[PDB]
Amino acid sequence: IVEGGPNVISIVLEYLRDTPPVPVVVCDGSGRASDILAFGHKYSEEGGLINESLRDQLLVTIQKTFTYTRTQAQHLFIILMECMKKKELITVFRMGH
């Protein structure tokens, strides 16, 4: 995965739910959707649970990077929980050798 839109969020939810579990190596720094997945895994408690200030900051980044209105941002936060659930398949390529 690099950068991507909300379409790659639904693609990640598809490929995660595929069994055999195709691991989603999400490359960082490219930004936009991979930055929602990246800042999710950067501050991930357990699976799709991330905290309140980071979830409504993510609502701002879905309302700006995706321009999805706040209800649809909570919708892609529900899909954020559903995708981030398999952090063992998410592999953050945070460069910064």
């Binding site: 200030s53 409504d56 900051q57 701002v60």
Partner: peptide, 26 residues
């Protein structure tokens, strides 16, 4: 310079989220 400028950009990560959160608050 490597550890100190590692500190500056990683701490302005907090400042970049701070201005964006105040934008939601305004």
């Amino acid at each position: 310079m490597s550890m100190r400028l590692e500190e500056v950009n990683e701490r302005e990560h907090s400042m970049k989220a701070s201005l964006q959160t105040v934008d939601i608050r305004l």
